[PDB]
Amino acid sequence: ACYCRIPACIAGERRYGTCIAQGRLWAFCC
């Protein structure tokens, strides 16, 4: 699955983008 993550993507994932949610920045990871 793909995830918006803080503080960074997990091993095995790539950061394909950014999420803005709950007034915060996240890495978009899949």
Swiss-Prot record:
Disulfide bonds join 2-30, 4-19, 9-29. The modification Phosphotyrosine is found at residue 21. Changing residue 26 to A: Almost complete loss of bactericidal activity. The modification ADP-ribosylarginine is found at residues 14, 24. This is Neutrophil defensin 1. It comes from Homo sapiens. The lineage of its organism: Eukaryota, Metazoa, Chordata, Craniata, Vertebrata. The gene is DEFA1.
